[PDB]
Amino acid sequence: AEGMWVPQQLPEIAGPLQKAGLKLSPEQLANLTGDPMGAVVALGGCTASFVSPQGLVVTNHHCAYGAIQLNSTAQKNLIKDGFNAPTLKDELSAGPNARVFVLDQITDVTAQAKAAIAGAGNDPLARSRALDAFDKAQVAACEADAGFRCRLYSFSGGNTYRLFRNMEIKDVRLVYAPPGSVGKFGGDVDNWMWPRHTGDFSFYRAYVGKDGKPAAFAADNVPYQPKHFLKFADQPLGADDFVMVAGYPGRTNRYALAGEFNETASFTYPTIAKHYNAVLKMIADAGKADADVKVKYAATAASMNNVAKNYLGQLEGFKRIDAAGQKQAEEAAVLAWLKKQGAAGKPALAAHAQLLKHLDTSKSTRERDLFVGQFNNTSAVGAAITLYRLSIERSKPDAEREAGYQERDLTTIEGGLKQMDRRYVAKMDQQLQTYWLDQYVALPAAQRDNEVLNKWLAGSDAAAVKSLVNKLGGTELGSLDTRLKWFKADRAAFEASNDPAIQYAVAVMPALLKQEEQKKIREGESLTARPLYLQAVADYKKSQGEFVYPDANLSLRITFGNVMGYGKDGVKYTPFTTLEGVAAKETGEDPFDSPKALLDAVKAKRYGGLEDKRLGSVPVNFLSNLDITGGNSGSPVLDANGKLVGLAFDGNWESVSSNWVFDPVMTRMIAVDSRYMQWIMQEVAPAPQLLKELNLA
Amino acid sequence: AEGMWVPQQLPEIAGPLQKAGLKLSPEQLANLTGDPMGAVVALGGCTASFVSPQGLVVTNHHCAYGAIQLNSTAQKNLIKDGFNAPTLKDELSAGPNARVFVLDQITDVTAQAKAAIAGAGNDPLARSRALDAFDKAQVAACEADAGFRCRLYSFSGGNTYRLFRNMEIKDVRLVYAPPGSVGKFGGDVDNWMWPRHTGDFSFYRAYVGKDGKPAAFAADNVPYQPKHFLKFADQPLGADDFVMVAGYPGRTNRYALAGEFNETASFTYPTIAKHYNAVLKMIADAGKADADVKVKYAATAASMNNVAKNYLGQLEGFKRIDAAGQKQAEEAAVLAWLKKQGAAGKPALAAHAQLLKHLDTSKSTRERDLFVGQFNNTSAVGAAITLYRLSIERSKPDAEREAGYQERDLTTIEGGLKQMDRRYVAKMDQQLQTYWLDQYVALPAAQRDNEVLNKWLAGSDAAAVKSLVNKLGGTELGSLDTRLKWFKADRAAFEASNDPAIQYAVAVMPALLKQEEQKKIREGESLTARPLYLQAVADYKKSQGEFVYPDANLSLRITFGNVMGYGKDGVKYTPFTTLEGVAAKETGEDPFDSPKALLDAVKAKRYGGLEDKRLGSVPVNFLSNLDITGGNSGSPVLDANGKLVGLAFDGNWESVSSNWVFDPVMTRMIAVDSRYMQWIMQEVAPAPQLLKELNLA
Ligand SMILES: N[C@@H](Cc1ccc(O)cc1)C(=O)N[C@@H](Cc1ccc(O)cc1)C(=O)O
Ligand SMILES: N[C@@H](Cc1ccc(O)cc1)C(=O)N[C@@H](Cc1ccc(O)cc1)C(=O)O
């Protein structure tokens, strides 16, 4: 079924859910801290779920990837080898910034947020500051009890605001990863593709202090005891079976204006794909010369591959469905429908006029901003900017500090500085600086008008770039101890440094703060017009019998439908893959280099009691017509009885343009079957202690 | 069904044909000069069929591509625009070397063949010379009547010989080609692929003189009047329907020795694919710079692309079915079975030992022979060699002239010199000479032992090559009128020439003639051993209840089966594509740039009365489990009643490895539906004159 339904829309999907084959009362799903919805957790960018009373958490391999990478070295490469913790004390910290978010409460604060905004009258900076102060005050009250972290969400272009309260678990440990040739079988070749044969799962365990409250890693921390956990399905999942997903999809753009879509299609997606593909080649070459570079940059390479291939898919998808035509036609239809209301339609038409005027004056600056932005987000330079910014914010009262730099953010900033140790190699960072400066100096003179960067380059050729990278080469910010000393330092200490990366951050900061202020003014201008125009689009869609649900915004959503394939002329994709398909893709070379134990078990048809007689093999991956996007990876796929039949992990090639224009015919979720997860843990990369804890052995 | 069945095996397949749904009696197909088999003609490398009483011939667009290319210029490009001849007088010569072969007679000459070989005694060179003499004598006799071309065919390793006698139509004219965007929709991307959306058809007409006998092109030649021609099918072709194909498969290797397969898999295919891919990039680059190069090298590019991609497909298919294992297992099974047969086994066991002995004599020279062979077959150099060779053979009695250099071959030699005019640009031929010379000079010293080439290079680097290419640029042989003079010149004129290409030819010729004698020796050593060992394999296969049929050898074969798709894990390929499938592949960029009229027609569901209600559209291509290979392109696909339902044109990706090891599961023929052919000539690239001639309007 189309739609990323908020839990508050359960009454509107209760009937469809039952019709599709849900056997739980839709009432049971409305208890968000209950069984089974209370078992679903946010990771921040990924979804997961509790699968044992001792705080065992299951998610995708690609979601645990960052944690696996932090614990990997060139000599002991857990990305390649996998990992298993036979006992609690074998579990590895997933890193200081790893989180498990357990939902505690949702509060609607729409009326209070709208009053905060209205209070600022016609002043857009005051409007931005008023919402910022409201967000901060809601969060501060909601976080007064230790161990909770709150987040304010804006829905439907600012027509609804809800405050979420989570128990914020901060000691997350790696329990189990399959080898990378299972976790990521087919690599970047099969990414965004069906047929799919990827064992995309891994396990964490949540921990808390001995006092029961969230704590950073400590030896005497103990496993979290969740109120609710999911059970692996005992009923074999088949074609046509009801499935549902709860999770945390990040962002969709289905309510974007036509001009927002056209800028993304014509500029953002092709441009990022081009540059990312070039940076990836540079990282791959560096990784061949030094495995330490390969391991340190593996999480960056995986993320950039995934984005660059996604963007290529979206561009092909837009042609497949004529997204530009569809956007143009719907936008024209909304304006005509508003014009038909006369008086009552004028405010939405005015709001549209206002939004339309924001949609440009980027043609001259967008390449500069991309290149300078990327340069500034290289490791040493970005650490310097973050560290200098923090020293500025610390001089203010906490409530006046920039979101991201408040007291509640300090342990996250520090964690970032710590994680950089496992994700930084000076010689690779120098190549990244050189790449992005090269693109900058190639811009026409009118466009290379970053005064500070022009001062530091003193030239616009390869020699000028080499001289600046050579100068920044002298930074001490590669040192974790130096970064942690700068974390505590005052503004004057930064301003006195002869560290070249620090000096660069000090020089660029005034211009960064002004560009940030202009951003907040532009945001404040939209806080009025965006909700009006998006409410009119939603009212129009409702008049056309179209499904009305908010764009994804990182909050909890429910999607549902059934196990089913899809088709193109001459081809029907079947809803399941099987063990034999994994072996048929074997090449003996990454990324089609399955573990020997897998090839041996498939050749022997060692099905481990998990064969689905309807397929004649153990299923591997399955297709369904659910509506998921980035953020949904690791979401539990539940059957009619609320049991875990798999994890969401990807979409097929034709699904990715549904970020902008939903296509029910060719949009499918790709999930890993819970039977494949068990079969891997039985026959290939054994986790006998996990199978015991999951009640599967 | 498996098998490329010779017409003499019709008794064996009589029952299977009936089981599969043939409504004609098998005896009707036994009549080779009768209806429908007498409608089936050879083009020499492609199949075709008569489709009107006025010698209208239908074949694939890729079979007619050479003819279309010959009639194309950068200004008037018939590959791109397509072609239609509204009247007999608008039809264009397909070129001097275009032919239609109409089967006159087949006679078995096995006994005489084997006697001729036995009679030479034991000298390998004598056995070869004796078979050559018998071939020439049987051909000379059979071709004494003015309008006939005959060919001796060796089957099943020399266990059977048959002489084919053909009426040789020497005036073939192009009547109709659709635009290249229909004829070759999807180009090299969709080549060897299902799903397929390619309208791969074109029409010729066969002309004779007013006396009713074959003539070269003349303005007062008239259409041939065939005794039999196929009728387009009136029954709509559906999934599971019986289909059959008669045609002229070139070469299969299913009876190859395990070592012949291992050399092909390990060296021949990967090496040719690598170098052809490199040359194709060069021709693409040169064609982009020069529209005259693009058109002149179109047919060469098309052919090299087809081989390179075929070879990459074969290598993948060998890995899919473990071809290396199957060859090893069969060979070992034959030898073990022969050792159980007592006295009966000893001649075949001894034959095997003789064959095994004369395999690997190449690992040393194979790279050199490939690169020098390719260099020698560049246009100017290859013309120089052929022309000097003819001048040498002319001075011999006809009967002692090398096959291909005899009286009966003169017209074909002269045709090639003329056709070169439309397929040569000096700067492109220089880049081809440079490419292949560059591969030669890269070889280790020990392997670079071509005496003449080393002398002409005077070096072993890019500069040496550039020096020799500069030298050869001096040639006159780029001029058609110069080539045709040399065609009639005697040996002494060649040996007197200071034209650097003639001088190169004169210089290599002694070493070429020795290499050719060593070839005939190697063929002579094999002429008794090969039949003995291949008869044992065939006897062993019969013992195991496997299908026994000869490897393709350019002679007429029958294959049959049913319209059916195929599958692999997660995917089922359906047996038909449809019009909407063509439109869905549209990018407006070559090779997915359909004619505006096709897109308009599809968008408007102008099905021109050709809808199949079971598909809900007009079918485009279809799949069937027939057994075809190179040479079968243009073959008519006949339904249960012997009516034309389409043309064979391709195989799916997994089919190509069946050249070496047949796989019934994933081997399919790809055919263009007779209704798509009608639909294009009605709604897109109109041919109202042909639609009437075919009785479809
Ligand atoms: N494409 C995946 C990431 C991935 C990469 C390589 C693998 O072998 C496996 C997974 C991805 O981005 N998944 C998203 C979820 C998602 C996004 C869009 C659509 O259509 C479906 C799923 C994620 O949250 O990581
Ligand atoms: N691959 C085709 C040629 C072709 C190339 C590009 C197109 O768009 C269409 C056709 C080809 O080589 N066809 C063969 C016939 C054939 C060979 C092997 C198998 O397995 C099936 C058919 C030909 O005779 O030209």
Residue numbers in the entry:
A (entry chain A), B (entry chain B): 23 to 719
Quote the authors verbatim:
For simplicity, the following description refers primarily to subunit A of the 1.86-Å-resolution structure of the Tyr-Tyr complex of SmDPP7. The bound dipeptide was found in the active site cleft of the catalytic domain and was covered by the α-helical domain. The aromatic ring of the bound Tyr(P1) has hydrophobic contacts with the side chains of Trp214 and Ile650. The hydroxy group of the bound Tyr(P1) points toward the bottom of the S1 subsite. The side chain of bound Tyr(P2) is accommodated in the S2 subsite and has aliphatic contacts with the side chains of His84, Lys206, and Phe671. The hydroxy group of Tyr(P2) forms hydrogen bonds to the carbonyl oxygens of Phe207 and Gly209, and the side chain of Arg218 via a water molecule. Thus, specific interaction between the S2 subsite and the side chain of Tyr(P2) is limited, whereas the main-chain atoms of Tyr(P2) are tightly fixed by the side chains of Asn213, Trp214, Asn328, and Asp672. In the Tyr-Tyr complex, one of the four water molecules at the bottom of the S2 subsite in the Val-Tyr complex is replaced by the hydroxy group of Tyr(P2) and the side chain of Lys206 is well ordered due to aliphatic contacts with the side chain of Tyr(P2). Although the structure of the Tyr-Tyr complex showed hydrogen bonds to the carbonyl oxygens of Phe207 and Gly209 and the side chain of Arg218 via a water molecule, the enthalpic ﻿contribution showed little difference as compared with Phe-Tyr binding. This suggested that these hydrogen bonds do not significantly contribute to Tyr(P2) binding.
